[model samples]
Target: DPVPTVFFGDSYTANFGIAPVTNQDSERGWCFQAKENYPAVATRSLADKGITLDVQADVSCGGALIHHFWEKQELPFGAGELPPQQDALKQDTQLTVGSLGGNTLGFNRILKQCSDELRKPSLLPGDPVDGDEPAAKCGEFFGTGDGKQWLDDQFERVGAELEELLDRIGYFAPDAKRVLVGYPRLVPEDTTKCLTAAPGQTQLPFADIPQDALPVLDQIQKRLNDAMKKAAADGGADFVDLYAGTGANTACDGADRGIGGLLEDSQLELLGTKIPWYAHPNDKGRDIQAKQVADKIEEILN
Candidate 1:
């Protein structure tokens, strides 16, 4: 019998900002209408290796938060939607892979705000000043007392919710091999070398964050990943440390070596529209991650 495998969580798991529909560029600016199918890729890789596996379903969404596990998510095109993510879990589900916890704290929103402050000129006298336009800049907000506290508080929320999520996974798929995936390291431990923007595209991988802020964000990401690992372990779930897999190939490592970097020159199209990609995993990155995940799945199966 074919083992049923399911994938869940956020953009990383969904491989957002990588592959897009051919019509992506038709939009006003960068778009996310389509993305790479890493879960599917991993499943295919496993099958190719002679591991009999079935991709049951992929409920992972680009901006999904942890709460979405229990909350009903609206489907695109105004169509009816499926039940909350956990509803997909079944007794026969043999394996599950998940990556979440970033958007819960509005991490991407913070990144956007930081980027705006770094690049866009402040309208008011009291507003934050812009950093060097061509250079990476950030952390000015994070350096503030309130901002620092916000970062800590957000992490606290994610930590608690992560544990709860793992517990729910166990309940819904009791017999399944649960693998909680972590976000890859987006920046180096010493973020001073982080790039202001991907080689071709103007959008920086981390929103053109400053050296000072880069380390701070890195610390926050590490804390989140660590919390996930602990939560999964406590819930009897295995944790896959993507941050550890890339080693030194972080955002600062450039396109080839890093999981995410500049946007590709080739465009992706769908629905007679062009979608845009950003600093997410490229083709090579997806292949590498798929194999890594497939190897882990192989272990659990045999």
Candidate 2:
């Protein structure tokens, strides 16, 4: 019997950075759901092994927030909009796997805040002549005061969102093996490694993202991973810990890095189309993701 499968989530699961997209529906916006993304790759790999998955839909798009699972997600910068991700789910879906929450956690906004502050000109009006000198400090921003509270609120909301998401997933695909995939490690555990910018070297962490911010970013991802695990336990699903064994392959690891580090030009193109930002897994990393996903599915089916 053919297993009915559907891929849903954000950029990580979509894996758009490395190749030109084959999904024409996503061409309208920056969704950029590449043909070689993990879901497709995993399906192909399974077929080669004499296993087959009838992929019903690949609804994953870039810039997806958690609520996008149930609601229409508006694409960024007037790119367009995407239908509710769960709409593709069916009663007979045997496998459901994807990743999300980073956007809902306000990760991109935080990056913008830090990057703007670091540029010595805060976007907020009436900050200062040169903006707050310490405003560039991401650690101080996220580790204390309003920033901390904001992050906490986001986490709280994400947990609730995950629970609701699980409820909907169960409702749609009661018999499916639901799996929530986590993000890859984006930075080194050692914060100091990203501190000094190397001139000739492609700087670690992100393109121009400073070192002090690394720890907070890393912490955020860790907490997000934990949140996914907790939801899997509390809400009924299998949580795939992509973060667990992906440490050495972080963007800071230079040659060994599987994910892309920076878009210094902030202009990652998809065959002349501009994509939004995020240090997503390159093709190799996507291959790793496919292998893990295929392994999980095989185990569950067995």
Candidate 3:
């Protein structure tokens, strides 16, 4: 069946860097772009000559999680807001691609809290920075502080949240396939490959990260992704391995320096910008991600 209606997950899904999104009206998510490029618009445009098709795109930018779609996007908010994404999951939609669970993993907040900890002294033995690499500073600073428990919580919280979110997606699009996306390799555990920005060049605590800490970060990310994947299967949604695919070309050892990670220069421009600019995919990054997802969708559809 031709996929006509397409629903995105949240901010990342909305492609925050596409343009400055002040509110829901100006939001243009990557999923929308993917739809236009791939099987959605392009497929139908050509099919009309001897075939036909239809497409619908719905992805808001106020930050959405698995549960957010059900609670915020699906449920009626107030006077003028239309029903949530759940409401739009009619028979027309051939598939649903949801990329969420970062918040449930508390990645942004964790980064902020760790940033604050870097100012303190002493660190845990297993902290990300307890090594000879330059990136270890951030981990030592924060890892010694409120970092341990914080990192630990991500696993369970993400799993539980994903379970709930998967259930909600199943309720809305029981027959449609749901895809869960994972974070690309961010901070490297080994400081030997330090890509930290010098001085105030970058806002990300990338400099603070240690070379030895990357393995731990990867483990945590994998754990969270694993949980979400399980939830998708349990909830009856298909799973797309963004983690592996993204890691393959953009991982720490990949050719593109920060394709799966953050860059030093761009960090400065994003500071206090009141935008979801940090630790997310830039336009080019999103384009790569969209292609990977589109490929998966086509494979699944066929």
**Judged by lDDT, which candidate is best?**
2
* Cα RMSDs, all models: 5.9, 4.2, 7.5
Q: Order the candidate numbers by TM-score, best to worst.
A: 2, 1, 3
**Against the true structure, candidate 3 has what lDDT?**
0.50
* Candidate 2: tens digits of C-alpha lDDT, residues 15-41: 757556665554434676777889988
TM-score of 3: 0.67
Compose the digit string of candidate 1's lDDT tens values, residues 1-302.
58888788776776665554323443211213234556777777778788877778777765677888888655444444446789878888878897878777655645554555323432111223223322333464555645677777877888788888887877888889889887777677666556555466565555445556777767767788888888888888888788777656676665544455433332444456443333456566667667777777788777
- When sorted by lDDT, best at the front, the candidate numbers are 2, 1, 3
Question: TM-score for every candidate vs. truth?
Answer: 0.79, 0.87, 0.67
Candidate 1 Cα outliers beyond 4 Å, as residue runs: 20-36, 74-82, 117-140, 190-192, 195-207, 257-278
Task: Identify the leading candidate in terms of TM-score.
Answer: 2
**lDDT values, one for every candidate:** 0.65, 0.74, 0.50
**How many steric clashes between backbone atoms does each model show?**
19, 0, 18
What candidate 3 gets wrong by more than 4 Å, as runs, is 20-53, 60-62, 73-84, 117-147, 150-152, 188-191, 196-214, 248-255, 258-276
lDDT of 3 at 274: 30
Which tens-of-lDDT digit does each residue in 114-177 have in candidate 3? 3333333311111222222233344543345455665666566667777776666666656766
